[model samples]
Target chain A: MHNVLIVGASRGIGLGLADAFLQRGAQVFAVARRPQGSPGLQALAERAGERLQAVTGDLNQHDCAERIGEMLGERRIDRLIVNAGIYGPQQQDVAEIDAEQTAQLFLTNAIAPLRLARALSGRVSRGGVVAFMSSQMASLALGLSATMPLYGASKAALNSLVRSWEGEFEELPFSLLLLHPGLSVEESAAGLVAAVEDAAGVNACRFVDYRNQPLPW
Target chain B: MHNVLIVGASRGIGLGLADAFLQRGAQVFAVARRPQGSPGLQALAERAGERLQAVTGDLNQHDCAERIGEMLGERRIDRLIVNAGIYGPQQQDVAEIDAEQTAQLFLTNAIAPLRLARALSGRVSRGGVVAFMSSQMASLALGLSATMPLYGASKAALNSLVRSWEGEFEELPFSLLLLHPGWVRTEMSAPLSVEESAAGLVAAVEDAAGVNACRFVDYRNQPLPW
Candidate 1:
């Protein structure tokens, strides 16, 4: 059985992925800021019993990755998916965006994911798959949506940072994937499971949709 | 006379542009954190006399644009080039990059440029050009250099922010230009000379005047991908 670690597993696609992985008989380590608060996560924990380990941590916190690392202990993660992100500020215009908001958005979306990935890099088993939640809006070539400029920029930065991270490794032991789950949480979760499973041992960074279609940088 | 405002004008392309604009008979407002500390700026100030008015302010500071706007008073800027940027931490690897360094890099390169442009947006004369010192690496389509990932990412963010800024205006009175000065000799031991790059950049800005659209182009005025 695979050991899947899904961060931001409280609701939406994250919660759905946790449920999907548990149904496949994988030991699911579901991280949520308030795991008990989510009825979906609570139900999964009850049904899966010891197989569903609910981890409480916020990716925004500076020490979040380290705390999660400590929780993992000797357990090796076969699939690590970081799905936490924020849309950041209803007003995404350049004139209205303040320094605090900009920092907060980038910190949560770009910087923290890399930090978390790096912190847990050693714990990921060989032939494992590491995935980040990216968006189609992250593609500068496709023309980032004007309505959500900061969100797109943050995800673009995240994409670039992941490339940089992969560049650091001379020969990566596992695959690195930047997954864009288009709209539907249930459909995306099902597709993402297959994609992650197929991506193991590929040992290269790829930007793709949940359906495993390659996305342009 | 075309009134030109060049931020980060202490050295390199910024200094070169300051000299080039002054030579072109434009009234140049050269902004630097330490204008007096630069021998090149001092030489230009001596030669150009009153044509060169040195302004001291760092864009990284919150009140920089406000301070510069106050200094401008009633005078409007015909050409505003924000050339300030930093290539954060010699170690560009993701594992090596810390939160503080990441924040500092984005704050200086991406955030500050937009904030500066917005603060001084009204001060730009109608049909004028506002240019940003972007790099070829900023082009996501061109493949960001592995050697300078953070620098490239910062510039990419800067490019995105500029696009967003232009998107806000239904019809912008001033044109926006993102320029890549082609690896000049000043900062890098590249083929292109700083003077050549500066001259081309100045011309590019002049050519962009009244175009009233956001464009990413090289110093040579060739268009680059978004």
Candidate 2:
């Protein structure tokens, strides 16, 4: 059975991935800042038999990713999905905004995912898959969306990280995928499920939007 | 008497612009981190006297633009061309590399010029021009260059910044230009500058490269190949 680990899978799209994987007969382990009883998640676990497992804690703490490796024991992960990110308060000119807040923003939306991916790259079952949840708003080609600078920069940087990973892992079968889920409506979870169903090889490290059009490099 | 600033005017392409403007009777202000006292600059300065002042300082500094603005005294700057940037130290992978350096990489390649532009925006004598020295390597389509991790990312970011700036500054006469000076054989500034400048913008921003169709955009949207 393919072992999958998703960071930020506690809710929304992440939770949806866990449920979808369970339905497909793959084992899923998810990490989230909060791990508690949810009406939606509890129902999925009851239905998935032993296919689903929920992990809770703030992965922002320096040692979070290392601790996650320990939690997984020796079961090497076949797939790793990084989907943790946030958009602060409202629209603000992030460039002109405070540098300190930018630090905090980067930590949440960009830093954590990058750091986690670095720590977990080795544990990923060789030739497996690594994915990051990037967005169209992250497309530097489409230009900037003033409404969300914090989110946009974070996603853009994540795409850059994917480039680095591709170069570094040239010899490894462990493919890196940077996906731009495009503008997901309220059903962020369902949209992700649709993306997975549509994903194929080499489509792994591409910046894609709703229609799966590859975004600007 | 419009005040125009062109960084990296020591020699080559920048010097060409200095000549072009002087011939047209327009005063040009040139800046180089260390200008090396080239003959071209000496001739231009001799012709215009104080009109052609080439100063020295790293434009990559935090206060670069403001400092350049202060040099303008009461004169408002009508144009600023940021041309100084490094080519490559190769692509340092994300996992193995240091984050602090990566941020600095973006700062020099991308952020500094834009920051300088924004800082001097108020001093932009109304209908000023802001030109960023971008490269074909910044293309998202041709993502095959071996080790330019930071350079590509920074330019890509710079491209978006210019596009957004145009929309935001659409009301004003202030214009933004993104030029990719093709590969050329020059003073060996960048490691790939020789191969890089094979097809040059010749002090111009837009060029006819194999990448995308080169179009000039002022307040209008430029066709940037992603």
Candidate 3:
């Protein structure tokens, strides 16, 4: 059975990913800020028994990655997906953005994910897949939308950082996928899983949508 | 005579720009974090007399923009050049960067420039030019260099932010220019002298006035891909 670890797996796309992976007969380690509070996750845990493990970790905390790493012990993760992020301030206009809120947004959306990924890099099995939830809005080539400037900028920063990570890591054993999700959670989860499977053993970084279509940087 | 305000004018390209503008007979307001400490700026002040005025401000400080605006009184700025920035750590590997340092780098390189520009927007003349010192490495189309990942990412963030600003501030009175000073010798090393880059930037800023849209170009006014 495949060993999969999904960060931010309590709701929406992350939760659907947990359900989909469990249905595929894979061992799913679902990480949430508070896994016990999510009814969907609790129901999945009840049905899957030992196959579904609830991991409690907040991305905002600097030590969350280490905490999750400790929980995994010697288990080698075949698929590691980081999907946690925040869309800061509905207004997102440069003038209206609060300094503290913007800092938190960038920290969680861009910096935290990379920190967590790097911390857990050693635990990923060879030929595994590491995926980050990116967005088409982050695409500079496509031209970022005016409505969500802060969100787009943060994701763009994440994309750049991931590229930098790939450059520095050099001989990474697993493929790195920056996946942009689609409309429906279930559909997106299914596509994400398929994309992850396709990326196995590729050992390179790619920016692609949930449907496995390549996206510009 | 043109009213030119050059931020980070204590040394390097900023200092050079101040000198070049003064030579062109423009009234130059030079801003440096520590104007008295810079012998170069002090020498320029002595020679230019009333033509060059030195103001103090730090990008790291939240009030720097407001303070600079207050210093200007009712004077309108025709060309505002924001050249202050940091390169962060030399070893910009993601693993080696400290959390605090990364935050500081992004704050200084990306956020501060935009904040300062927005704060001083009211003081700019209708057809004035607002120029930011952006690097070519920031260009996503150019493919950022692996050597300076943090710096490149920060600049890319700045670029994205500027585009958003242009869209949101739909009817801006002034033109925006994101300039890459090619290989200039300063805190960093390059073949182009500070003087050459500064002169080109001055020319580019002058040429950009009345073209009230955001443009990313080099010091020589050559356009770069978004």
Candidate 4:
């Protein structure tokens, strides 16, 4: 069984990913913000038992990288999924954003995910897949999604970071996938697994859509 | 003649832009962090006199928008170039970048320009051009420049802002030009002369005036892949 790590696994897509892998007989580590209070994850943990290692930690903390590192120890993760993100409070125009909002949005949505990846760099097995939950709205080619410019901006920053990461770590024997995780749990879980499973160290990496189609950068 | 406002006009590309516009007989508002010590801009001021307005303020300041607003008053700027930016310390990897650097870079390179644009939205003349000084290195399709990923990321953020502004301000009369200001002998270590780069950028702004939407192009109006 593959050792998979899924962050933001308390509910929604994260939890869905956790269930998908656990049901498939893989050893999955799930990070939820509040593991004890998350009834969905708690139920999964009971059914899957040790197959789902549900842990709790907020990725926004300065020490989160170290905290996550501490939890994983020397266990080599076979698949890494950074799916945690916050859409920010209601919709606001880019002009309407403040410094505090930028900080919170970026910290939670962009920097935190990168930090989590940084912590897991050496811990991922060779030829393992590193996936970031990026969005189609992050595509710079599209005119801004009038409903949520700030949110799209954060994801765009993440996508750019992924590009940089791919360059810096090209020799690390891993593949990077920027996935547009669909809104539904089923689509996200399946898309993530298919994409992650298909990734190999030797091939050129790609940004895949929800249906696993490659998108132009 | 156009009323051109160029931020970060103290040195390098910004300074060159200020000089080009002044020489072209356009009324130029040059923003420098240290207006008095910038000999290049000061010397241009000597020749341009009342045609050049030397303003100073930290774009990092929270009230800078209001400060710039007060400086412009009712004057309608015909061409606004958001050229202020930082290239980051050389050779730092993205993983090596810290939180403070991330905040400062995004603030100065991305948010500051957009904030300035927001403050001046009503102050710009109808059918004018608002151009953002972007870079080819900011292209996400290319491999990271390796030595300056943080800088590239900041520019990418700015490109995103340009897109957002294009959508949010579609009702505005002006157009947007995401300029890949050629790497010149100065800031980016460009082989192109400063005068040539600045002149092409000014021409691109004039071209943007006739268009109704945003266009990502070089100083010579050549398109780039997104």
Best by lDDT: 1
Clashing pairs in 2: A177-A204, B90-B147, B91-B147, B183-B196, B183-B197, B183-B198, B184-B196, B184-B197, B184-B198
DockQ, computed on Cα atoms, for candidate 3 = 0.40
What is the C-alpha lDDT profile of model 2 across B134-217, one tens digit per residue? 755455555533365555655655665555555454264565667665544473245544222412333333222222222332
Over the stretch A131-209, how does candidate 4's per-residue lDDT look in tens digits? 8888876778865455676677777777777777777653756788888786678777877777778885643467887
Q: What are the per-residue Cα lDDT tens digits for candidate 4 across B83-195? A: 87787646545445565666677777787788788778787788889888888766778755445666776777778877877776637588877888877887773579888
Cα lDDT for residue B202, model 2?
Answer: 30
Q: What TM-score, computed on C-alpha atoms, does each candidate reach? A: 0.86, 0.74, 0.88, 0.91
| Candidate number with greatest DockQ | 4
Off by over 4 Å in 4: A62-73, A89-91, A94-96, A169-172, A200-203, B88-99, B169-172
User: What does the lDDT read for residue A202 in candidate 3?
Assistant: 90
Docking class of 4: medium
Quote the positional error of residue B143 for candidate 3 in Å. Answer: 4.6
Residue-pair clashes, model 4: 2
User: What is the C-alpha DockQ of each candidate?
Assistant: 0.38, 0.29, 0.40, 0.50
Candidate 3: misplaced stretches above 4 Å?
A89-102, A169-172, B89-103, B141-148, B169-173, B220-226
lDDT of 2 by residue, A131-212 (tens): 7887776666576554554456556655664564465455755656666654343355555554544553332455655455
For model 3 the local lDDT of residue A88 reads 79
